[PDB]
Amino acid sequence: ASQTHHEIEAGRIVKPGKRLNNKEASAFKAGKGTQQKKQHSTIKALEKRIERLGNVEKPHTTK
RNA sequence: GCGGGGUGGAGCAGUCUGGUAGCUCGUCGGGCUCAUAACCCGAAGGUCGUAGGUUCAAAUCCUGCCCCCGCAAC
RNA sequence: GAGGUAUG
RNA sequence: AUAGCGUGAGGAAGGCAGACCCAGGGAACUGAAACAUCUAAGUACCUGGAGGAAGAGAAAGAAAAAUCGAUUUCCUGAGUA
RNA sequence: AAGUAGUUAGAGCCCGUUAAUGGGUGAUAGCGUGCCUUUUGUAGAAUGAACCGGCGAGUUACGAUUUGUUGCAAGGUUAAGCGGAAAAAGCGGAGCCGUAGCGAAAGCGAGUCUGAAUAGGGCGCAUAAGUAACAGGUCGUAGACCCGAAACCAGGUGAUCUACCCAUGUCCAGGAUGAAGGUAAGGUAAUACUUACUGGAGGUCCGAACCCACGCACGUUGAAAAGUGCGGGGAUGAGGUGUGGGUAGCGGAGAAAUUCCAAUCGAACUUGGAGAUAGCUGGUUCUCUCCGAAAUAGCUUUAGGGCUAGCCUCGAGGUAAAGAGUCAUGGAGGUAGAGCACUGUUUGGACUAGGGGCCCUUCUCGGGUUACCGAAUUCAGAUAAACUCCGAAUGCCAUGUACUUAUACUCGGGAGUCAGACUGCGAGUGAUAAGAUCCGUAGUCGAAAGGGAAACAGCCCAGACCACCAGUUAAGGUCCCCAAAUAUAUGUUAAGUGGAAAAGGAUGUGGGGUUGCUUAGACAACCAGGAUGUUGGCUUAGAAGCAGCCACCAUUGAAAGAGUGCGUAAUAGCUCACUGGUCGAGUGACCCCGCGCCGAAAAUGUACCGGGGCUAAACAUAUUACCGAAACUGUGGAUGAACC
RNA sequence: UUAAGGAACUCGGCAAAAUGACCCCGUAACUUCGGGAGAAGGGGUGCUCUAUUAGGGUGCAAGCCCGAGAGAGCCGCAGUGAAUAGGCCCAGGCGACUGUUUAGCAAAAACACAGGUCUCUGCAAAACCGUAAGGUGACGUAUAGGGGCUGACGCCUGCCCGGUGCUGGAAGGUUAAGAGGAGUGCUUAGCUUCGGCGAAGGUACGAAUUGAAGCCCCAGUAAACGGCGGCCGUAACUAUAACGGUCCUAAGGUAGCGAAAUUCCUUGUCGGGUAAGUUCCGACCCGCACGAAAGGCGCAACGAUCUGGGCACUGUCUCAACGAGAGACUCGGUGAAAUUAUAGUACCUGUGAAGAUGCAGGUUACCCGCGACAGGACGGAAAGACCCCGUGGAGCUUUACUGCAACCUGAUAUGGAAUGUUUGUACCGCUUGUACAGGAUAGGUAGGAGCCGAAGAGACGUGUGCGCUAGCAUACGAGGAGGCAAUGGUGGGAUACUACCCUGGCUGUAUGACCAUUCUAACCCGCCACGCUUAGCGCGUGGGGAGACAGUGUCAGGUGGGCAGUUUGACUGGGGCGGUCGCCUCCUAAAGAGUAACGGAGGCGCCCAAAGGUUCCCUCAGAAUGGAUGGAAAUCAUUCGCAGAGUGUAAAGGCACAAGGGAGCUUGACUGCGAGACUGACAAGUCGAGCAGGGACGAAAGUCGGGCUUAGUGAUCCGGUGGUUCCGCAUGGAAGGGCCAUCGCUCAACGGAUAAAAGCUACCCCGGGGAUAACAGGCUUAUCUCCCCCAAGAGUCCACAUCGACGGGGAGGUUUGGCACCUCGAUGUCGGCUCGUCGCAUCCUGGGGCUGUAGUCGGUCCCAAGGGUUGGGCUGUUCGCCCAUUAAAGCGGCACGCGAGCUGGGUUCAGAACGUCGUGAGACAGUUCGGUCCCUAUCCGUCGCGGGCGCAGGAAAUUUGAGAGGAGCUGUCCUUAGUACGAGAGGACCGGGAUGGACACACCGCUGGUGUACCAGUUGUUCCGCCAGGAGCAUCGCUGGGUAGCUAUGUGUGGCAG
Ligand SMILES: [K+]
Ligand SMILES: [K+]
Ligand SMILES: [K+]
Ligand SMILES: [K+]
Ligand SMILES: [K+]
Ligand SMILES: [K+]
Ligand SMILES: [K+]
Ligand SMILES: [Mg+2]
Ligand SMILES: [Mg+2]
Ligand SMILES: [Mg+2]
Ligand SMILES: [Mg+2]
Ligand SMILES: [Mg+2]
Ligand SMILES: [Mg+2]
Ligand SMILES: [Mg+2]
Ligand SMILES: [Mg+2]
Ligand SMILES: [Mg+2]
Ligand SMILES: [Mg+2]
Ligand SMILES: [Mg+2]
Ligand SMILES: [Mg+2]
Ligand SMILES: [Mg+2]
Ligand SMILES: [Mg+2]
Ligand SMILES: [Mg+2]
Ligand SMILES: [Mg+2]
Ligand SMILES: [Mg+2]
Ligand SMILES: [Mg+2]
Ligand SMILES: [Mg+2]
Ligand SMILES: [Mg+2]
Ligand SMILES: [Mg+2]
Ligand SMILES: [Mg+2]
Ligand SMILES: [Mg+2]
Ligand SMILES: [Mg+2]
Ligand SMILES: [Mg+2]
Ligand SMILES: [Mg+2]
Ligand SMILES: [Mg+2]
Ligand SMILES: [Mg+2]
Ligand SMILES: [Mg+2]
Ligand SMILES: [Mg+2]
Ligand SMILES: [Mg+2]
Ligand SMILES: [Mg+2]
Ligand SMILES: [Mg+2]
Ligand SMILES: [Mg+2]
Ligand SMILES: [Mg+2]
Ligand SMILES: [Mg+2]
Ligand SMILES: [Mg+2]
Ligand SMILES: [Mg+2]
Ligand SMILES: [Mg+2]
Ligand SMILES: [Mg+2]
Ligand SMILES: [Mg+2]
Ligand SMILES: [Mg+2]
Ligand SMILES: [Mg+2]
Ligand SMILES: [Mg+2]
Ligand SMILES: [Mg+2]
Ligand SMILES: [Mg+2]
Ligand SMILES: [Mg+2]
Ligand SMILES: [Mg+2]
Ligand SMILES: [Mg+2]
Ligand SMILES: [Mg+2]
Ligand SMILES: [Mg+2]
Ligand SMILES: [Mg+2]
Ligand SMILES: [Mg+2]
Ligand SMILES: [Mg+2]
Ligand SMILES: [Mg+2]
Ligand SMILES: [Mg+2]
Ligand SMILES: [Mg+2]
Ligand SMILES: [Mg+2]
Ligand SMILES: [Mg+2]
Ligand SMILES: [Mg+2]
Ligand SMILES: [Mg+2]
Ligand SMILES: [Mg+2]
Ligand SMILES: [Mg+2]
Ligand SMILES: [Mg+2]
Ligand SMILES: [Mg+2]
Ligand SMILES: [Mg+2]
Ligand SMILES: [Mg+2]
Ligand SMILES: [Mg+2]
Ligand SMILES: [Mg+2]
Ligand SMILES: [Mg+2]
Ligand SMILES: [Mg+2]
Ligand SMILES: [Mg+2]
């Protein structure tokens, strides 16, 4: 869920607000790209933590 | 576009592990009652969204489509 | 005789 | 009685040559084209002891059908095992 | 009068030399965007340098390998050490290399290992030159080419700044407010309680000194490495300050900000390990001569690094001369194209299993069936990177004795390269865009000067050893800038097209090809008629030549359509078609070719031929001269390889 | 200092102005009853006389100081006359407060605070520093001390203990070192024949059993970490749901508050305030995503806090003017710096590493300077801090990896004496022995035919014990000899009795473990008395206390970000996400081979004991009919049929004289190898006739070293297994190794870094790069804007007045984008201010054509760039909405013009906080508060001023005018004429004239401003010796005026007519 949350954030990082101007928005494209990168890094860190949880197996319900 | 799901009327399982249709509420009928409810007695109602596949056989395994709830996009 | 100890 | 205290006879204390050696303690940078075993390295550095040298040293040894005869240093063995 | 500052031509002026086709200056004319670095590419609006001078970067030891030289040669050589002048011999043969290899080894031995093998094959021998020393090249270990990190570790120095604290001192003008408490009067049964007075509390108020630092301005190569001025907060308290002291970096102090620990703090300063390491950038100093790349493959914790190969150079080899080019001949191959013989996509037609409906019915069983669809089947015709019955050119493999020509291969030493750029051709991605990107192919640049494209890496022509006040030529050009034709002949163009841009529009202009009418009279104008039954016949407020629907004939006449449009309630009127008179020669319709026009507009200043300016100095066709390069030649010099 | 206005400025009332002192009157909501409060709002202040004053202080008195009201007057614009000395009010958020904080960008809503709460701690406290001693704590003692959280006060603080931590438990499971030492190998004295067997001892390795804490487990615990849900339906209907059902939960958010320091949509809606309000106040509640000690809600006082409004005040502004002084300027003296390749350093257009002082072509331009401005020199400074890269670094975090301290725990040594429980082991005794069938309570082996017994048998009676609840044994009373077996049957087995056993159970002994209690002599005492000794250290002596515990050492397990060292991929039309990474097949791939891309399509990580080998045999798909279930299509007959089938599996190639299908026999799915080729960097992969060995099939020829072919896989290193005429560190062995065969890799990031590895950085750093991004430029032009072709149609009709579908073509280079070509040894960003300039695709004015143009007004289109093209509210804002005007309120280019010209609100520097995501460090084109914009102008250029020379003599004046700049705008009213036109409503063209706005120029006579060497008034104090008159300083002291000069807001004129 947090991973979806950071995906939403990352997609928003690079779409400028209505309040902005073209020329003004164009100046922070790169820093917003790096914010986006940081979000993606958070995502990959979450995936690593999920791996570190393990492949816990559902218990066996004998038929 | 990404997730959940689609199984009698409602909500939920059952799927992963192919042969098994289930729990609660409800519905219909007959009793009790002056009558309704509650209670007691029985019964019905699902081909598991859909079209095709695999299999001896599919709710169940594979594929495409169509719908609903969320989240995004817009 | 007094005092007390489900619905219409 | 010992502790302690006092007296006397000796002795030490400290320094250096930013060198050489003996011990105690002991890194990391680096290299491995990361890195942790490993390396760098028992190096640098601290400290203690010294002496003109120190250390080692007179086989509980090295070796092999043949024996050699205390230690040390050099050449080789060898960049071999 | 601009001009990488000179150069080449060159007057005039002035001097007189290492005397030699001399010196200094230079009006003027032509040409001309520094050096270095890194780059596909730099005048570069990329980097570096103020200038001048000095210093400042491949070295030494030891080892490996190879080349050359010398000595001995199946042998060669000594190391330490004795000796001795910090010598030279002599001694020293221990050891090292080579002479025999093969095998994991035992072991066998010109053979050996594998293997059952006597087979074959691997490695060797056959097929015999090494060794010691010197020098050159390179490699390795060492800082190893020079400079350069941020950081790490170890030993110490620092709390005279600053944080916190310890003890001891000291400072806070003046004013204001008026807590608790207390006393007295009133009040009460007694308390409450009220009023006054007293009192002097407070992280209290106001406000200087003191401390701080909120705002603004100025300063900002400052008066000052944090201040100045004007205002501002606290100012008896969690106060300010002095003196002396403590806490020390794997740490301490923190009313806590990553704050402070001597102008240094996400871990001080100094010294040492230490020339850390740096696949990174920068730099790396004299000359000429010969040859001369690459920006690719593959692998890579790899992508701006490296390694091997491909490409360069040097040397030596070997010959059944193997290279390159063309000719001939023989072959693989399935592209372009073409085709439909399969597979897909598809158009039209024939025809239909089947589905939907109207239904007749009816246990909706089966029919009437519907063009409402319709699997398929079949006929003709289209289409294809991942379709092919077919199938080239080229390119490739080879053969040859053909005919030219100059390499190719092998071994060894030494590298550098692994960012590539445009252009043309073929394909992708892309948008059939990009100076985009990615392959293939060839070329140029890179690493290439020169002539032409105005200027211009990458286009066109073409390859600079040197000199020459010689010649012929290429591309491109010949009126002037600007060298050479105001060239020759025939035509086109009228826009400055040339010297920009589309669909599309257009009686532009020229040339062809057709076709109709026509001196028994065309076209064009002018004039006259243009009728009638019926107003065709319905509708409507209208339709009555000319809203719509259908019907679309007849009469006379030279002609007239049951009328081509404007218009009306429809009339009406304007008019058309058609007819005749007048006139007197070409006239109207199409298709193609060429050259032009409109479409067509942008931002400092004409500004889309380099400019002037050209109507030929443009375009097409053909031709003849000339200019024009560092090309080629001529003349003379220097030089490399091969052969003489 | 300023006319008039007065916040229109602006991010914002920044700054400035205004207030200001003493006395008096008077003073609100609210309030924690202290305050608010100097609230606010207003008045008076001078001098003289009454006045040695009423009255006070002092004093023996004389005298000397303080000076209360009042009247009566005097003068000024003004009487704290100067200087010094609060601006106030309303509303709101936050934090209660005073205080502290990032020395040198942040003063705050952050820290602290008192207060609350949890928690721990019995004193040699806990916690901390340190190796330890020793100390703080504390010279204290649970009303004390440490840590965590919250943050005055008021009302309150809800549910959840499933997880995670913390506490406690104590039965079991798992769990070490150590203890134990069953056994196994090797060795060999002998035994054996070779092979081999093998005692003792030594040696290598070692199983059982034992073995703590922790963990698993159970309770509890939330002011501990933390968490606080969905779906369907339901009211007489319109909506919604008080109500019901059901899943999941550990439990599903209580109060209170709420577009919030939190609300995206969102400038939400409504209301208020304003002409106009993205801000503000109050309410609403779809709370994207409040919420109860990460505290909730509220709140007086406080605040250099943030926010909104108002009164006053003002040069903030409309829109600037004057004055003073300091620089600047000239003279004299003295005398740097950053920088610098050399320089004789123009403009346009273009080209060019795509933005030229220096190139080209044109145009301008005499030489040398001075003062001023800053467009450019991609100017200077600072080897970009953004971005990317580097197998670079530091700091931080954690359930990344590996470790370390520290603690907990156990064994063992220091370190011994008893007693006792509970198990264990061995021995003596005594009881124990039931499947079934069978007389019935059969343990086994053997003997066994007789055996026991009056010195006490069977049987009877009683109790006790067992137990299969049948009965067995055991003792006790009487009694006194009799019983049972053999035999038979039952059965695996026989009964009597005898012995040796086994299985348990009990007593007794003897050994040997664990645990507990006690003792005391080791050790310890941060207890006392004494002594050394003037000593709160130490040591000794005597008591007292703990005591085999503690502590220390060695070993071992656990916990362990408290501390440490490190890791945390590459390609990539920037990086990142997504995807991919190795092998096979096609297309691309351009007819040999090869050939790239984040180019288009698919597959693989197997299977088959027949799906192989051979020998023999035959041949498919599909259609046409004929036919019973049976049909579109099962199976059958005939015909057609080069393959339209199948080929284990993707595709390509190939195959019907099989490589496709059956059957038989079999295992060549063999061992050794292999001339030679393919491919190829290497590693490797591929094909291979044939030789030998020994076989299978077939009569034989001959074929067969897997499958029609092409994928089906992974190095070494290290281990394991089997085998071997190999080695075996003195010899014999052995261990250990080699050699051959084989095994163990989603080492799939597949030529594999290590056995073993994730993250934050907004506190950051270094080396590099325009090889690589963000701004700007350049190329392109899908898009964007603009223009047009066609013309169905709309428009009573009528395509083309005005629009114009389906489709089509272009221009431009303002948008979104693509490319990555200059610049990373610095090319500064949005918005605004100053200044503008250019284009035209013209907004207004001007001219005109068409009109579905009556007139007025208008629509559309052509020519035109001369001039003009507003001021405010909200927001940082461009944009946009609104108010009000205008003739009109143009679109765009210039590094979306302009930061060596200014601002610096926003943003993305460090602080802090909200909500949210994260265990966390931390982060968010989510928000909020707060926050350092350096430079002395060399050259060109620009604006002005001079010097030099020339202009064929040297001078003085006046001048033509090439050429060049400037200006160029426009409304309203009257009239024409209420004429034309119109049914009316309405209402012109053209023309004539008057008066204005904005703008420019000039000037100061007027209105005003300024006027620091003019005049006056006046305060305090010093001086001129005193009075008087004057002077100095106090912003020129303040104040009232004001000359010249300068000047606008004032006046004159202008753009007329052409
Ligand atoms: K000695
Ligand atoms: K051989
Ligand atoms: K210092
Ligand atoms: K709300
Ligand atoms: K400038
Ligand atoms: K840059
Ligand atoms: K500028
Ligand atoms: Mg089923
Ligand atoms: Mg009732
Ligand atoms: Mg390393
Ligand atoms: Mg320049
Ligand atoms: Mg420089
Ligand atoms: Mg120099
Ligand atoms: Mg010190
Ligand atoms: Mg105070
Ligand atoms: Mg105060
Ligand atoms: Mg001050
Ligand atoms: Mg104060
Ligand atoms: Mg002081
Ligand atoms: Mg001090
Ligand atoms: Mg911080
Ligand atoms: Mg070192
Ligand atoms: Mg260095
Ligand atoms: Mg050459
Ligand atoms: Mg083709
Ligand atoms: Mg093809
Ligand atoms: Mg390119
Ligand atoms: Mg090419
Ligand atoms: Mg190069
Ligand atoms: Mg050239
Ligand atoms: Mg040229
Ligand atoms: Mg060049
Ligand atoms: Mg040449
Ligand atoms: Mg010639
Ligand atoms: Mg000429
Ligand atoms: Mg030549
Ligand atoms: Mg004023
Ligand atoms: Mg005034
Ligand atoms: Mg305003
Ligand atoms: Mg404004
Ligand atoms: Mg202010
Ligand atoms: Mg505060
Ligand atoms: Mg500060
Ligand atoms: Mg500050
Ligand atoms: Mg507290
Ligand atoms: Mg202690
Ligand atoms: Mg707090
Ligand atoms: Mg526990
Ligand atoms: Mg604001
Ligand atoms: Mg709570
Ligand atoms: Mg304060
Ligand atoms: Mg000056
Ligand atoms: Mg740099
Ligand atoms: Mg760490
Ligand atoms: Mg390291
Ligand atoms: Mg990368
Ligand atoms: Mg090919
Ligand atoms: Mg041995
Ligand atoms: Mg790889
Ligand atoms: Mg922050
Ligand atoms: Mg850097
Ligand atoms: Mg670039
Ligand atoms: Mg760009
Ligand atoms: Mg640029
Ligand atoms: Mg520079
Ligand atoms: Mg610069
Ligand atoms: Mg126009
Ligand atoms: Mg605002
Ligand atoms: Mg505004
Ligand atoms: Mg700009
Ligand atoms: Mg700006
Ligand atoms: Mg500049
Ligand atoms: Mg700001
Ligand atoms: Mg932010
Ligand atoms: Mg801000
Ligand atoms: Mg200046
Ligand atoms: Mg100057
Ligand atoms: Mg005047
Ligand atoms: Mg005076």
Ligand SMILES: [Mg+2]
């Ligand atoms: Mg006087």
Ligand SMILES: [Mg+2]
């Ligand atoms: Mg004075």
